[PDB]
Design a protein around this ligand. Structure first.
Ligand SMILES: *CCC(=O)Nc1cccc(F)c1C(=O)Nc1n[nH]c2ccc(O[C@H](C)c3c(Cl)cncc3Cl)cc12
Length: 300
């Protein structure tokens, strides 16, 4: 069926499929054990994420997955993205094998690590000290920016950059996921709410939402939303605003308020990312540098 690319091809019998992790518009993701992903260590076990089609995919579903595979091949390797490890295309179902992030997505990461509430009785010397500190939050933002900077350099547009689409490793390294996806930009159900209550329309740049125009600067807009997510510790954007109201508010030029416990430096960058004119928004290179200054100034 598909042609053999020996550079990326990996023997499917060296995979042991484990627990299903979730799914997207096309295909599902399954945790798996891989043996000898590194050819120098043929019997070495590693944990990977395997992308595959659902139980009757159309050929469009297959074409979407193949298209994702080819994007993954060309983009290359970077510390702050989910990297391609190998593929299974011969004699069996199509597998796209990618890096597995131990701690799940950034949204759930932050929400599970919100500071202890006012109802918890003080127990020990760190009763007020939550898992999340400001410099770590800044580092999360900086890493995502560096990852997006890399993707931009490889002429890759994400088109749904959000905390949900950023994954966290065992060492709290941010890795941008699903950057090479066909996302059906000409038939988006703008009112669609996910099973976890997400309204993806709230991450779209105005030119993307209103004009169906995607550039790297539209990703920058989304990054601004992601910044807001980070410093609300996994909050949902435009709180209490349904999609219909979002439409009119965006047309009136409405912007989100400065969230609590968020320094002006970071709300400043959010607002810059939300400039009406895409050219007036910072580039990811500028975002990386701007965030780095803050990160260094607080990393004594
Ligand atoms: C193998 C490590 C692992 O199981 N990690 C993990 C545990 C629990 C929940 C998770 F979401 C993960 C995780 O992030 N798995 C994972 N590793 N690489 C991936 C690449 C894509 C992907 O997609 C699924 C659908 C997904 C996304 Cl994009 C975002 N949030 C959750 C999920 Cl399940 C998941 C992984």
């Amino acid at each position: 069926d598909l042609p053999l690319d020996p550079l990326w091809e990996f023997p499917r019998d060296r995979l042991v499929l484990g627990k299903p992790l979730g799914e997207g518009a096309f295909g599902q993701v399954v945790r798996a054990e891989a043996f000898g992903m590194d050819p120098a260590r043929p019997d070495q076990a590693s944990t990977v994420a395997v992308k595959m089609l659902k139980d009757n995919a159309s050929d469009k579903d297959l074409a979407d997955l193949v298209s994702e595979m080819e994007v993954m091949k060309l983009i290359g390797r970077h510390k702050n993205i989910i990297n391609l490890l190998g593929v299974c295309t011969q004699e069996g179902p199509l597998y796209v094998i990618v890096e597995c992030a131990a701690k799940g997505n950034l949204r759930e990461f932050l929400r599970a690590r919100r500071p202890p509430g006012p109802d918890l009785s003080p127990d020990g010397p760190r009763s007020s000290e939550g898992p999340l500190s400001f410099p770590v939050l800044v580092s999360c933002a900086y890493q995502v920016a560096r990852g997006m900077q890399y993707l931009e350099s490889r002429k890759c547009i994400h088109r749904d950059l959000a905390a949900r689409n950023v994954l966290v490793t065992e060492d709290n390294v941010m890795k941008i996921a699903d950057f090479g996806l066909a996302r059906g930009v000409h038939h988006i159900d703008y009112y669609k709410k996910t099973s976890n209550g997400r309204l993806p329309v709230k991450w779209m740049a105005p030119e993307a939402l209103f004009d169906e125009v995607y550039t790297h600067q539209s990703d920058v807009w989304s990054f601004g939303i992601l910044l807001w997510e980070i410093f609300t510790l996994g909050g949902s954007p435009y709180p209490g605003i349904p999609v219909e109201e979002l439409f009119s508010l965006l047309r009136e030029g409405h912007r989100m308020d400065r969230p609590p416990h968020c320094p002006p430096e970071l709300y400043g960058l959010m607002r810059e990312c939300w400039h009406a004119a895409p050219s007036q928004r910072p580039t990811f290179k500028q975002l990386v540098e701007a965030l780095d200054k803050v990160l260094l100034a607080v990393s004594e």
